[PDB]
Design a protein around this ligand. Structure first.
Ligand SMILES: [Mg+2]
Ligand SMILES: [Mg+2]
Ligand SMILES: [Mg+2]
Ligand SMILES: [Mg+2]
Ligand SMILES: [Mg+2]
Ligand SMILES: [Mg+2]
Ligand SMILES: [Mg+2]
Ligand SMILES: [Mg+2]
Ligand SMILES: [Mg+2]
Ligand SMILES: [Mg+2]
Ligand SMILES: [Mg+2]
Ligand SMILES: [Mg+2]
Ligand SMILES: [Mg+2]
Ligand SMILES: [Mg+2]
Ligand SMILES: [Mg+2]
Ligand SMILES: [Mg+2]
Ligand SMILES: [Mg+2]
Ligand SMILES: [Mg+2]
Ligand SMILES: [Mg+2]
Ligand SMILES: [Mg+2]
Ligand SMILES: [Mg+2]
Ligand SMILES: [Mg+2]
Ligand SMILES: [Mg+2]
Ligand SMILES: [Mg+2]
Ligand SMILES: [Mg+2]
Ligand SMILES: [Mg+2]
Ligand SMILES: [Mg+2]
Ligand SMILES: [Mg+2]
Ligand SMILES: [Mg+2]
Ligand SMILES: [Mg+2]
Ligand SMILES: [Mg+2]
Ligand SMILES: [Mg+2]
Ligand SMILES: [Mg+2]
Ligand SMILES: [Mg+2]
Ligand SMILES: [Mg+2]
Ligand SMILES: [Mg+2]
Ligand SMILES: [Mg+2]
Ligand SMILES: [Mg+2]
Ligand SMILES: [Mg+2]
Ligand SMILES: [Mg+2]
Ligand SMILES: [Mg+2]
Ligand SMILES: [Mg+2]
Ligand SMILES: [Mg+2]
Lengths: 187, 147, 103, 68, 51, 52
RNA sequence: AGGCUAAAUACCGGCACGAGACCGAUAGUCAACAAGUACCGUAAGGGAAAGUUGAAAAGAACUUUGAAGAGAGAGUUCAA
RNA sequence: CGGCUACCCACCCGACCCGUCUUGAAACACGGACCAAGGAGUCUAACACGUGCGCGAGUCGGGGGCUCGCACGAAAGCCGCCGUGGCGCAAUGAAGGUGAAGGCCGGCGCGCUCGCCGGCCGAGGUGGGAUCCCGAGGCCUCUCCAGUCCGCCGAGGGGCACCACCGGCCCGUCUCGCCCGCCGCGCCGGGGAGGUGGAGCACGAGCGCACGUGUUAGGACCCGAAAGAUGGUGAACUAUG
RNA sequence: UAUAGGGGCGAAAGACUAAUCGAACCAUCUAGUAGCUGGUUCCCUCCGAAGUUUCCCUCAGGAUAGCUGGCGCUCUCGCCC
RNA sequence: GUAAGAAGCCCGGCUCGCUGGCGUGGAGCCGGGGUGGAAUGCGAGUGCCUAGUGGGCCACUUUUGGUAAGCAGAACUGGC
């Protein structure tokens, strides 16, 4: 024997993208070449986000993609998103900003072309910026998923605020013992 | 797909994924929700609080039909009518305001949120909230009750 | 028998459901039967239109669907008397007549 | 049918299989569990800090920028 | 036979104190009056009876 | 029956053409374009095998 | 506190019927065949096994040992 | 001539007969005479998680309808003034019900542990936070000079996601006090300041299909009982008239 | 010829009732349930336990925590600190 | 068990409805200053899903009951 330590062979990583999308594989090839040949950590992170799954790339929203450009210093920069930018029903005004994302929805593309912006894809973003200069890489609201609101140390023991599974949210379904002090214990 | 099944991979192993010592035979713990109070209390408690007992009043012959009131927010209040309508109605013409009826859209109660611009409208609904009514008064619109 | 954090399940399968399994293997069969029934009606019965008798404008009784509208059953005999025609004469003209519908 | 009653043998090894963890990361410590009279101090003090800190701190920043 | 009628009422001017009069409190006042319509009548009958 | 990316399908109700992921997808043209080869490190083709 | 009425619906029995990502004589109905047959139990009832020569019998004329069963020659057949 | 090998034999060394109950099997523990065929984690419904695809604050035709009669057609295509409906976009209450925007500036009432008027901004702040931006500086065969050229960085800034904390809003209860409106001046409604309970809000990420794992109920990985109920058949043996 | 199954019959042994009687035979419910024996079908590679806390009419069993595997995500190094 | 620093040290100033002789004390907020702060080794943090397990035994040392046990029961560590 040599290694007195435990044997953890592979750390965590996903090397090749599990998706069989040919377009995603071509983008993986192109951004892998740029990541290993341009010394660009932007291309490193975008290549890792292309290795990243469908679920861990949450859909970006149009109001958030406006507000992350409304901050000072983001006038002429391009909002690069590895993921989808969708419509928002809340917004009223759209600026003249540039979009570089995968699979922008139809109403979002329509409102951006009415507002006067320019949407791109990753090959056009690579032709315009090999190292990724003038870009801001954005990500979406992961923790607001319905799946993540069931996740915690417990459903209710220091009251725990983590949403136990039930059919119908209301009366007669999980509201009696441990949910109030009058009927048994209370958390 | 039986070719992608774990059973096809586990051919050759004697106990077949369930151990030689424990011997999972038929139903070792019971059936279904068996032992909800006696011996599975650490799984019915600590994972489903509230499962045992009565909670309140008992409305005999309840319907999910009389309490029908789908709520609309002030964010959703604008896109019930098209954007062309509000642009061509508030393109610097006069003090006229378009009517946004939520009853035709299928919503009954208007609730209060943010993002309500300067251009006032007239909202007709069967119910309102005081916050949404104050937001409509602040942007200058008119409140109309219908039935 | 239970497990980690999952929803409490009470399926209604304790009754011997395997005898009474009605699976729609004859759903395109009923579709072809009902197509041929409508076509044979439109051929053999009359030059009357399909869905022959005329249905009324009717509001749905609810606090939920009363904003919408519905094709009812019949023309509500007071309405038919104001229109001024006999009952079975209206039924042979093509007017659907329901004696229960009030106004 | 007498069985073994209770032991703590082969327990510290299972503890050190996964490396017993300090909580080791609490920056800006949690605030629940503290005196309600002290909280009636601190919340009103924080919201009046949010309200009335503008002009004196602004003139002090101008004065220290002029003197340094 | 559907004939989903489309009343429009597009052009109208913002008007007088109806917008100040049709506030949220009318619904709560009507709710309280519907809840207390009968007990006030009983108290009026008792006040007319007891002289 | 399907339409271009400008207009919708006139025979179908609510169908459009899908989103095109890579518009100009010539990967050889992209990797041999001067804008990409301007921003490359150097061709490092040495092997550097095991030294006894 | 009297009554009738077709349609949509159901059908593992029956008369014909067409198809199959099904099975292949230890499988598929118990039964591909003289199968609810042979056979068992007083009776209620239980209940099998069992497909394939060849293209056509052209199934081996005739000689010979043995009383025959069988065998050695000979012959038919692409092939005994 | 060469040749490892599912051929046979000899020699040196090691070598107890497999499978599982067990802390322990070669066991004087159990099953196995031998061989051929069959033989055991399947399917449905539901849930949860992960992954892949389509659309995306929407999503889904499984329910029907439309095509000319077609072997594959029990397929497939379409409906859209067929979106009825399921899930999600709003939660909290037992319920009546109620129901998520605040911040900045000027003036006014004693800026009074205190409200109004006018304008502006807009989902808050702090500490980390991939990335991105400005840039002192210096580096290229002899000089003043420049532009892209070789070429990074001290320091500064806006800060994705997410974590930790503070603050704010909504619902039901608790304490303290004042003010406002009248389709009618009442045991009428509404509003303020604090600490609590919620599966909340604090720019939403769901819907549909498929695959994988786990659980549940169905015969549920295969075989197995002493037993219970229902309906029939036997006094040709035997027991008694 | 009469008595037929929780019935018959018994000079009483719970003996006999078609080789079965301290509850007959045949079929159905029924593939009854079993925390209990036995078995569970191809290869290679990697990681790899426990017989412990608490609770249960719990002691041959289960739930929970611990031990374990898989799937990732967030970052960090390669250039006097 | 604890401490061996950039989450730390000092200076200046606001807020408080807590407290009170006192601009007193304490908390919070804002701005600025200098990182070379014991040794050795190592790249770390975190989320989801889940099988098996729930009959153990032996040995050095410390020990409980028993006269003693290859006996029954405990502690650390190692092994089966
Ligand atoms: Mg080695
Ligand atoms: Mg290992
Ligand atoms: Mg194994
Ligand atoms: Mg088990
Ligand atoms: Mg389990
Ligand atoms: Mg049953
Ligand atoms: Mg034990
Ligand atoms: Mg009648
Ligand atoms: Mg009748
Ligand atoms: Mg009928
Ligand atoms: Mg055969
Ligand atoms: Mg047979
Ligand atoms: Mg023949
Ligand atoms: Mg041959
Ligand atoms: Mg055992
Ligand atoms: Mg033993
Ligand atoms: Mg053995
Ligand atoms: Mg023996
Ligand atoms: Mg043996
Ligand atoms: Mg034997
Ligand atoms: Mg076989
Ligand atoms: Mg999924
Ligand atoms: Mg609807
Ligand atoms: Mg539902
Ligand atoms: Mg059985
Ligand atoms: Mg019983
Ligand atoms: Mg006799
Ligand atoms: Mg006798
Ligand atoms: Mg009987
Ligand atoms: Mg009985
Ligand atoms: Mg006998
Ligand atoms: Mg007995
Ligand atoms: Mg019996
Ligand atoms: Mg079975
Ligand atoms: Mg126990
Ligand atoms: Mg467990
Ligand atoms: Mg783990
Ligand atoms: Mg692991
Ligand atoms: Mg398992
Ligand atoms: Mg055990
Ligand atoms: Mg011992
Ligand atoms: Mg012992
Ligand atoms: Mg060893």
């Amino acid at each position: 024997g040599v290694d007195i330590r435990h044997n953890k062979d592979r750390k965590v990583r996903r090397k090749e993208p599990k998706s069989q999308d040919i377009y995603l594989r071509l983008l993986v090839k192109l951004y892998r070449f740029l990541a290993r040949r341009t010394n660009s950590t932007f291309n490193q992170v975008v290549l890792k986000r292309l290795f990243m799954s469908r679920t861990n790339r949450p859909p970006l929203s149009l109001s958030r993609m406006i507000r992350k450009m409304k901050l000072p210093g983001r006038e002429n920069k391009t909002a690069v998103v590895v993921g989808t930018i969708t419509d928002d029903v809340r917004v009223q005004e759209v600026p003249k900003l540039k979009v570089c994302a995968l699979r922008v929805t139809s109403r979002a593309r329509s409102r951006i072309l009415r507002a006067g912006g320019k949407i791109l894809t990753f090959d056009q973003l690579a032709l315009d910026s090999p190292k990724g200069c003038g870009t801001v890489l954005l990500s979406g609201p992961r923790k607001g998923r319905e799946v993540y609101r069931h996740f915690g140390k417990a459903p209710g023991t220091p009251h725990s605020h983590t949403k136990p599974y039930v059919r119908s949210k209301g009366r007669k379904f999980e509201r009696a013992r441990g949910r109030r002090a009058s009927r048994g214990y209370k958390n | 797909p039986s070719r992608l099944r774990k059973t096809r991979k586990l051919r050759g192993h004697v106990s077949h994924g369930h151990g030689r010592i424990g011997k999972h035979r038929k139903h070792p713990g019971g059936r279904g929700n068996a032992g909800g109070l006696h011996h599975h209390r650490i799984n019915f408690d600590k994972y489903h609080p509230g499962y045992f007992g009565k909670v309140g009043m008992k409305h005999y012959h309840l319907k999910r039909n009389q309490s029908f009131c789908p709520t609309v927010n002030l964010d959703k209040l604008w896109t019930l009518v098209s954007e062309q309508t509000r642009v061509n109605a508030a393109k610097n013409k006069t003090g006229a305001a378009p009517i946004i009826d939520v009853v035709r859209s299928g919503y009954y109660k208007v609730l209060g949120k943010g993002k309500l611009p300067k251009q006032p409208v007239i909202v007709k609904a069967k119910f309102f909230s005081r916050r949404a009514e104050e937001k409509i008064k602040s942007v200058g619109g008119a409140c109309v009750l219908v039935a | 028998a239970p497990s980690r954090n999952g929803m409490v399940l009470k399926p209604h399968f304790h009754k011997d459901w395997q005898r009474r399994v009605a699976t729609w293997f004859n759903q395109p069969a009923r579709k072809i039967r009902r197509r041929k029934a409508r076509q044979a009606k439109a051929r053999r019965i009359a030059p009357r239109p399909a869905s022959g008798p005329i249905r009324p404008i009717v509001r749905c009784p609810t606090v939920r669907y009363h904003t919408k509208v519905r094709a009812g059953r019949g023309f509500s005999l007071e309405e038919l008397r104001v229109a001024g025609i006999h009952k079975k004469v209206a039924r042979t003209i093509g007017i659907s007549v329901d004696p229960r519908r009030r106004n | 049918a007498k069985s073994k009653n209770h032991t703590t043998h082969n327990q510290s090894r299972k503890w050190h299989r996964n490396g017993i963890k300090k909580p080791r990361s609490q920056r800006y410590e949690s605030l629940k569990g503290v005196d309600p009279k002290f909280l009636r101090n601190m919340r009103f003090a924080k919201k009046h800090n949010k309200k009335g800190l503008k002009k004196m701190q602004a003139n002090n920043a101008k004065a220290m920028s002029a003197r340094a | 036979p559907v004939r989903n009628v489309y009343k429009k009422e597009k052009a109208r001017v913002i008007t007088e104190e109806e917008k100040n009069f049709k506030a949220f409190a009318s619904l709560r006042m009507a709710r309280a009056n519907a809840r207390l319509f009968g007990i006030r009548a009983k108290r009026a009958k008792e006040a007319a009876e007891q002289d | 029956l399907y339409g271009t990316w400008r207009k919708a399908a006139s025979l179908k109700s609510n169908y459009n053409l899908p989103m095109h992921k890579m518009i100009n997808t010539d990967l050889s043209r992209i990797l041999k374009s001067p804008e990409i080869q301007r921003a490359l490190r150097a061709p490092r083709k040495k092997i550097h095998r095991r030294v006894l």
